[PDB]
Design an enzyme around this catalytic site. Sequence first.
Site, mmCIF file in Angstrom:
data_model
loop_
_atom_site.group_PDB
_atom_site.id
_atom_site.type_symbol
_atom_site.label_atom_id
_atom_site.label_comp_id
_atom_site.label_asym_id
_atom_site.label_seq_id
_atom_site.Cartn_x
_atom_site.Cartn_y
_atom_site.Cartn_z
ATOM 1 N N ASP A 46 50.716 20.170 54.090
ATOM 2 C CA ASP A 46 50.048 20.774 55.255
ATOM 3 C C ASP A 46 48.884 19.916 55.764
ATOM 4 O O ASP A 46 47.792 20.426 55.948
ATOM 5 C CB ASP A 46 49.515 22.179 54.909
ATOM 6 C CG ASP A 46 50.610 23.098 54.427
ATOM 7 O OD1 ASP A 46 51.749 22.989 54.947
ATOM 8 O OD2 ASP A 46 50.420 23.938 53.517
ATOM 9 N N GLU A 57 55.579 28.435 62.694
ATOM 10 C CA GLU A 57 54.226 28.535 62.134
ATOM 11 C C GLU A 57 53.431 27.257 62.410
ATOM 12 O O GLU A 57 53.705 26.522 63.382
ATOM 13 C CB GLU A 57 54.338 28.783 60.614
ATOM 14 C CG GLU A 57 55.132 27.692 59.884
ATOM 15 C CD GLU A 57 55.497 28.036 58.426
ATOM 16 O OE1 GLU A 57 54.971 28.983 57.852
ATOM 17 O OE2 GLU A 57 56.332 27.360 57.836
#
Lengths: 534, 534, 534
Positions: free
Chosen positions: B14, B186
């Site tokens: 991430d 997302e």
Amino acid sequence: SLIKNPILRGFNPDPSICRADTDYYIATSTFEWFPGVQIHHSKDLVNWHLVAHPLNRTSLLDMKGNPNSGGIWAPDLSYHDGKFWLIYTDVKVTDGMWKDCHNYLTTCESVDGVWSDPITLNGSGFDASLFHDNDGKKYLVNMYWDQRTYNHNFYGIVLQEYSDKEKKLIGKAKIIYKGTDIKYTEGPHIYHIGDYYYLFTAEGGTTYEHSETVARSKNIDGPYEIDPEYPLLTSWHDPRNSLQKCGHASLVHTHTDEWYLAHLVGRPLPVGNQPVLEQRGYCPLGRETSIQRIEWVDNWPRVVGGKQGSVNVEAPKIPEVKWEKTYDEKDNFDSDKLNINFQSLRIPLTENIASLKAKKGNLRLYGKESLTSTFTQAFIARRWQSFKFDASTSVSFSPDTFQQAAGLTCYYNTENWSTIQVTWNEDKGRVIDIVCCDNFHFDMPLKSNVIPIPKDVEYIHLKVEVRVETYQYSYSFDGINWSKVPAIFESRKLSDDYVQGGGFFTGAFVGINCIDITGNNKPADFDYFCYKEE
Amino acid sequence: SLIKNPILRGFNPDPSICRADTDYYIATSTFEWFPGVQIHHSKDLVNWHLVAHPLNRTSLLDMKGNPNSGGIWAPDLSYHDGKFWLIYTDVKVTDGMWKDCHNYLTTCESVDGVWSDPITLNGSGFDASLFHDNDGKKYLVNMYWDQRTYNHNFYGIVLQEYSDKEKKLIGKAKIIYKGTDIKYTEGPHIYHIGDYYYLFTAEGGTTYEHSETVARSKNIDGPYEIDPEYPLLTSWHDPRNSLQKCGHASLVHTHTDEWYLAHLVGRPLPVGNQPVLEQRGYCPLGRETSIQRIEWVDNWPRVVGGKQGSVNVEAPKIPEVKWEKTYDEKDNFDSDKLNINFQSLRIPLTENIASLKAKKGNLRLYGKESLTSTFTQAFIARRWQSFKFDASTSVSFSPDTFQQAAGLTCYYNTENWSTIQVTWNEDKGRVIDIVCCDNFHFDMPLKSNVIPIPKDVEYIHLKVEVRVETYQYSYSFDGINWSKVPAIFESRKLSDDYVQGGGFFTGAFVGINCIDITGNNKPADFDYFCYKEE
Amino acid sequence: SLIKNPILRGFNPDPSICRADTDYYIATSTFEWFPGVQIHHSKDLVNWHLVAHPLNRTSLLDMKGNPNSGGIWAPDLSYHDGKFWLIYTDVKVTDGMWKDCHNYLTTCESVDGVWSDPITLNGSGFDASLFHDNDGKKYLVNMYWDQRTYNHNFYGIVLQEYSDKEKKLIGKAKIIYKGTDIKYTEGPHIYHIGDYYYLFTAEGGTTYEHSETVARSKNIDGPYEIDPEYPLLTSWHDPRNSLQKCGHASLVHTHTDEWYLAHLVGRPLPVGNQPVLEQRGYCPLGRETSIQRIEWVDNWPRVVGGKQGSVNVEAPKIPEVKWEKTYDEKDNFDSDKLNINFQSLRIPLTENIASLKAKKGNLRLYGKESLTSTFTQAFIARRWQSFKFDASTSVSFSPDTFQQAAGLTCYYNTENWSTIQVTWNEDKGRVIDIVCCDNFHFDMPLKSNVIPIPKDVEYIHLKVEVRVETYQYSYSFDGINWSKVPAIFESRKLSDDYVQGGGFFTGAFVGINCIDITGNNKPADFDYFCYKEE
Ligand SMILES: [Ca+2]
Ligand SMILES: [Ca+2]
Ligand SMILES: [Ca+2]
């Protein structure tokens, strides 16, 4: 008079009975339910009332994030030197090769008082118990855990001196007893009576195989001789007995010179026309507390009426004292103190989660995390204590997203529950819906057939009718006329026997909650909570 | 010269890349590992060094009892108005119909300073990101979670204004985008560049189906039009590419007017002679960070070299700046500060758990809870950052019960690890033993063939040799002559792809720990920790 | 005209296409369904009609007791020396480290003639195929099975000369090809075209990862060079294509000097608002047959319109010839030959199981074993061949025990089916009931609400309405007015993708059965059977 078992109904396991002059108390285990340790009181052993939960502040009991059926396992309550002593265990790991836990001691002049800051004990196993000997010495006993994967985990009973002066365990810990071939040896309590130290232990595990056995020694360190007639207590061999899972006992000597034995039991739902040895039953009321009369034979205690345990038991020669109920069938939330029969999950309630002050005559729950969270749920609940009862509430709530829901819930743990909710849908606005989880399988059985709520309805009334093997929810927009919602649930699925996982140690609850995933803490106002047994 | 992907190796998912003048930073997710949020720094995009973990005290990050792969999910690091802004998420529920979580903002003038107390944001989903517009306004975007059981959980991307003045989100939240048919939409980031707002999202889930897509709009709240050539980035269709799981990206515009895209990847162990579409791989190094060059065509960004992501990437036009290693291959525990490459589980280390001060030149670990505990483990570890390496330590420890153990451990989560331990046996005294857990299946494969340790050995040396598909432990009593222990482990079993459950988001670690179930806090003294990649 | 794929609808996998002068035939696999090997005919490749099942006697095909999806795997039909040759495989073991099977050869002058007693071939693997070389030699190719647990099971392709004169395989068997990195190398066929032997194989497994690849050699023994552009055919990379699982192909050279490729496919039900890469679909029509056009580039065959396979394909330059339907929408059972679209499980029907000669205009089924038996079921059924259709029947039956039931059934295998039955109950007499099995989970959803049938009703009409994702049963006591049974079933549960176990290779059927556990062989008379697609 007769004791009519069980004496403590619904979830009330691991009874620790204790005498203080002519008062009698039982402490039961509470696991993840807060505040911790139920204490019930009695004058006559027949009639009991709930009077305290000592573990009511974070500094005594911090269970935020604790697993289901972690937290408070079997408690130990004693009375000595003019005060009460409570040994309690916080269990952090409930399955696998370890059972990481921590034992503590706290004291108080009275059961309903402000209990002292906790003394750190050990963690070698759970079921810690404080024995006060007649020479002023004190000893902690507990089970000793063996994690090794090729060994049974229950290594026996360890004994270590406790120093009140130093506020710590002192000297060497010793294994004093290894148990019988039944194993799962746990729940130790020592009693020094006449010529012997008697070591009572639970064995067999807290299932249908549960039992209590007694061993004795002339010295506290053993070796202990096992009662040739063991077990003392068990209904394992009798699947037809009303009381099952009979074990985890504790002994009391009354001021009337009589002997009684508190122990847990389970009462299965009807099994129907099914093999009686194979299908021992499902117990939605969890493990409850019973008491048996004890008589002595050749210097061993023996259960009057047989090992299996009886339902009706001759009471001690003490005048009858019945208590008024500790709750109102219809609780209108008109008091600033939440009723003692309500608990919440894991943590103390604060005014940011629940308030009786924000709006007089209502309980306001400010929405927090979902029914699956082991952290902060805005959820209060009380035990199922009969196989047949009605519970209801009414709530004002203005959800504007499916992330907001408030309602009535029957709950065992974070993966075993059902609920009727006021929530919201994109196309219909405020609606009534059903949600459930059955050993981590989730469903919303109504699908698109949710029930729309008129904009002008302020309080939506919600009810559950529990009828032995099944239960069903209803709603009402006027508090008089009720409509049934077509989702019928099985009570057996909210039972110790059905739920999956290493920890299956609580029981069914019914309660009210408010969920707000958005973080807006949306308030739901509950006007009342009814609980009425049939 | 050239960028060589991955730029951040081992567990480093991430990536949130952020420019501050001529410094570049990447924040990566840390989940249950403490302190939280790794921040690496670079001048040139080629050479990177680990410099900070902002979330290093309880007031910022309280993960005691958090599930595996809960805690810190994708972070968001920005730089605006002369300071850094970090948005982070504490996930409390990692599986089932909800994903209960809480988003927070903290700021600091330097990445390695003392970050401000967290400002409470929302909880309507994870992957929260703070966008600073050029008109002084600020907005938070995140995924919006739909718990309804008959719906995909990823409802789209929500937008709400954030007020630095009021320290809170203000105005109404709005769904601005629903994603493509790949779904799992997302990781939203907004970039206002020229005439457009560009909305980047990750899609497909962080597995082999991972991707990133770009949409654009003239206004911040949409409607957003999707790139006709979506996705921007994915290797889903190319099972042979060195970089897999390419997604969850962030965009940086360099001070040299160049464009780069940081993203996560997985690098599978060799699959061998097995069907290449079916067995996409096991990634014991977890999700790592790579960076691609971007070029613009018709006002859409495009990955130079093709959507799949390339290993070798043209570096920006900046003078190279290389960094000293941030650890020593042999750490002699000679400093009072634990190496930045070491983390522990969930909570701050305290002097009651680990100390470099108690005996200078040693790390003293005071025994706490087992390898299965989500509360307090006396356990420090560092990432596997290569498929081939050696790690070793030596330990002085005097256990007097099988309840005490200290050693070297390869670990993924509480139900996936293996360890070589100094512990104790009734018949042999101090011994070396092996314990492991494979998706909650426990074993102690040596059984009675534990290795006795001579009473006169002070430090017992322990080593793991990791050799791609397998690894194996050895020990030594003299630090020179090693003996292999006959238990060979599969590296793939410490991978995101192997481990069971809803949270599979970290990666393999190697470290040292001390367990003491008794509650005696028995100290183990570790003289060194070696980590050497081959 | 255009060919419209699929050309053979519903369960019709592993197409072996064959030219005999100006006739075209396709054999498809039938697994446990009897009689074995479906053969369809065409003059033009556009229009097809079912014309034969060669394996219609026990001497050819004995599958009593065979596992679900055992029996007849991919067949191989060729035409040479004035006659048809059929290679077939009887698979006895469908899961685990072995795939015990037996290959056989039979021949006939016509496809619908009486086939010769079978010649025993080998068992080294399934997917056996007979290649007739232009020098008068003949060879068998099949996949070669490797059972070793640490290896992929698909060892490559074995070749061995077959001697028509000696009626056996002769000389040595040789591995001629190992396949590509996609693996699951099976379905081998050799074509000697100009200067090359072309070896076609299916790879990837018959799931969404299915493909066909071509390799070539100047000599039959190899070595074979793999097509640089492999695969030839596959929709793995395109989750949105109408035709999925494209593989297991065979090549035909028409008499018009054109090239076509028959191959299997799956056509999933709508997946709805769900991640397109993750949920590739459920196929209740099983694996169907399609045909693509082939062009030649650099001496490699190439699929016209792209590797994914097209729905609409240019037809060969041959006059179109259309066929009458091979069944009546309403079959009145007036002929003494059971309609060719009907099959039974495993074994030949005899007059003791099913008779058209017991009562004119009825099919009488004499009750045998349950829907779970792999031995003898009195059950005939036809394929689902559309997502939307009505099927119905009417039955006369007089059960006097719950051990007797007859009705209409949708059926995949012995642990995946549902049915509406006429049966009997102690309190209500003759009743309509529902029974289903869902991957070995059995249910009777009506419970005590079985539906009483009036004593004077002589034929009970039963119907299923299949409507894409769901289906539902109804009944009528007068053939005019219909009542629904309150039970809704999911069509996806009768799909190759949903069923558990090693063999998932057939498709949904609908049919009629009679069960009599008592051994009394109670007759049920079926007056008609309707099947109408919509
Ligand atoms: Ca009220
Ligand atoms: Ca040192
Ligand atoms: Ca008829």
